């Protein structure tokens, strides 16, 4: 109650996160060094004892949080929610995606991944575009190319590798089209097509997720410094309308 | 008449186009397992009738259309026709690009595809003076190093298609260039400008496509949600210098 | 004098300009023609014919022109210098390049070309900075490299080749490095921030060329519309400042 | 003092700093020379007389300079400090890097560098998440290929390296996952998400280097010129609201 609010002003403090994120790395450290497979069995044990203790610290945390905030409130934050699946499902095969709490954690870099997610909704029709183009460039190319070319076309799902090789630019004409050429001499109609359409699309798609991930991310930063982001320069004028429009009226 | 509207008020529903939208998807489902060689006669009989299907549904959809609009309506807008045109040659040999209907269908993937298409003019002298580059580049390089390397360079042709692979930089060192300088010690004159000039030019003509596009699309999804769209600051200055002539001619 | 005014009336209309066009495209779809090594001695000789007719309307054309402007005055464009020397050293081994004419006698394609080279001063220093980090990087790999590895970068010019191909990421691992750490295992020491550097340098002198050029050619597109261009936003707020200084020394 | 002052004039005049340009310049060729190991002793003792003598020069220079400003004031700017160093390191193996004061000496060439390295703390945060990524993605790589595929995954330092050269798409497939796979079948689910996640945050961290460098750099070039830059839009309407509300509040 007055512990409640004492225990956030500590979950809320500068040096309770830089604890959180040294935990976070030390426990990335020992994973890290748990992938050496030349470890003696002790030096494992050892490690293994470091990341127990440090899920150990993770549970209190959260507990500290699912306390002070109650299970309402906790979990009306989707980091608060991954913070605690994460963690959870450690209590039951990658544990090294446990890392990724020094992004839920430290507050610019959730304001990174925050622009990102949130730009995604609006490039979702560039998105789809890509999917369906791949979608027929597939089928197209397993009917096309895939009694002579089976490893790269023998089915739909080779295809989808493949094209998606060939929309990297990736060995693309010595590896695989000049290949097919051999045997199929106008298979450059397809190639070439499929080459420009896709870098174009998969370049709109990277450049509109970029663009507005950092106009996202850099007004999220401004709120959290002050409150407030800068008002649109349409805003500005709109609201320059307002204050023209009445300084006309006055001026009658 | 009220037959003509209400019928109007069937095809522009959401419902409607959501059934359309599934009848693609499951068209398109269709001609993907179909591309798999090793199914029973009955499997693909099956498939073959669920295709039949679904291309009729496409007949009634298309006439319910050309009907409560007339033949001139209809025809009027490039989607109907694409949409027509699509549907009709089904009636007479890559029956996956009817996939190709998601977009003609769904109205924010039209407006990604239309913002495109309307960038295409405004980079059209970019992407001839690529042309141009290619053209020039192919007539050299079929003439210094055809007789020696007639697999990349015999004839035009060939120039051409392995001027566009050396473009987009695949192997272009390893795989063509450093052979060709064996015999040819001076040919990285010609291909490290050929090199920088379109990978420079072909980035312009990208950048210039995908930034128009994109403000394109953007005042269509504008239109279609408000009736209008955002006026250029530019208009908004314009339209402040009419009220601020006004206001001191007021003033006086 | 009213014929020098006559003269430059054909020079300056559409149907002139279409016509030498149509004699740019002919002379290099001639050329074009001759790569191919299994013509007849009839038919080189005929479409060689061709070529000197080509050449023979050009030469009529330049002389209408260095007339109709005298020699002061024609000499005063760079275009016209550039088709002068093109045309004239035709008289005296890489013909193809009077397909460049398309670009000086095509205005849409000559406003392009001249944003890119007006875009060039202000790109000067970040691309003397990438020369630099090549000079330093090829000194570099020639003295750790050089002696086990001659043939990528056994001297200067070798290197500076082999720093290239990396640059621009071909087969810079499989291809060069891994076999380089072989013998040197810290080589990625080296490698790895020349790449980051130089893909980011160059990338920032792309950018920069582009997005200064697109500026430029759009100015030079409003110019040749309308005799002006849009005034900087920035000058509409310096000149909206004029008129709000003295909109508030009227009003006292 | 009046002996300071003079100095100084001369250290910030344009003829002094084209003469330590032309040093630097001829130190740089000399030291390519010099990679060239089919010299004479002699040609060899001489170019290396000919660096002796440049690096004399600097000492000069710098002394001219640390007196001419006092301790205080020449260590004071990281420029001054960066020459100081590089010239006195010589005085005790990459030479070569001397050349870089070709940046620290030539005005534009410097403030090309100042704005990248002031654009690197905004970026910070999109790098940190990249170096997060590829934490992750390389501990998992070495687990779970590391014992199947020990060259390129048998260790951390392994796994980080050829993810970079996956990151940068060079082989990708058929060099690197192709192989992967014809062992571990789904392994183009690790790998296919690592290329997307790592091309969109590297990209995003080039373009805001890139964006924000130029801005920089400009205003630097502005400053240098005439002692001022231009205010950013909002300041420009932010003052703009300023004499409007006194212009509504005189106009009562
Ligand atoms: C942008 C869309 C990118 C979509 C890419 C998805 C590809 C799916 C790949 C897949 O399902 N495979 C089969 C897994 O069973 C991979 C095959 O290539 C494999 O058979 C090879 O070893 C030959
Ligand atoms: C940006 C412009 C890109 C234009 C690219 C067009 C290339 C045309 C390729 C072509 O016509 N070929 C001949 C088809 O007859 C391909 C040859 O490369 C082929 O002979 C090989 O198998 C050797
Ligand atoms: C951005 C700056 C890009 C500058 C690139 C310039 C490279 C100059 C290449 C050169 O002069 N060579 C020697 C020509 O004599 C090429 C050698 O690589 C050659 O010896 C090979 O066949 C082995
Ligand atoms: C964006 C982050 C990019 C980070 C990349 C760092 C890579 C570190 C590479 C390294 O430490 N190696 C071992 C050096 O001891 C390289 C190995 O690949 C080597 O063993 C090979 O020859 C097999």
Chains 1, 2, 3, 4 share one sequence.
Not at 166 to 185: K, Y
């Amino acid at each position: 109650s007055h512990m409640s609010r004492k225990i956030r002003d500590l979950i809320e403090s500068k040096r309770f996160q830089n604890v959180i994120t040294a935990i976070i790395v030390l426990n990335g450290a020992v994973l890290g060094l748990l992938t050496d497979t030349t470890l003696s069995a002790s030096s494992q044990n050892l490690l293994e004892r470091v990341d127990q203790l440090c899920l150990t610290i993770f549970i209190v945390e959260i507990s500290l949080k699912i306390y002070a905030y109650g299970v309402r409130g906790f979990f009306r934050s989707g980091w608060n929610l991954f913070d605690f699946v994460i963690v959870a499902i450690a209590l039951m095969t990658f544990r090294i995606f446990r890392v990724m709490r020094l992004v839920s954690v430290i507050p610019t870099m959730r304001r990174v991944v925050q622009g990102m997610l949130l730009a995604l909704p609006g490039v979702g029709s560039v998105a789809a575009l890509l999917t369906v183009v791949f979608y027929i460039a597939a089928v197209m190319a397993t009917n096309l190319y895939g009694a002579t070319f089976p490893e790269w076309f023998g089915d739909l799902s080779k295809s989808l590798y493949t094209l998606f090789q060939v929309m990297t630019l990736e060995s693309w004409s010595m590896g695989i089209v000049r290949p097919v050429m051999n045997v199929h001499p106008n298979a450059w109609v397809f190639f070439i097509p499929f080459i420009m359409l896709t870098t174009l699309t998969v370049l709109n798609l990277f450049i509109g997720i970029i663009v507005d991930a950092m106009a996202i991310t850099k007004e999220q930063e401004e709120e959290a410094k002050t409150g407030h982001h800068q008002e649109p320069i349409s805003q500005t004028l709109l609201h320059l309308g307002d204050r023209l429009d009445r300084i006309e009226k006055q001026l009658a």
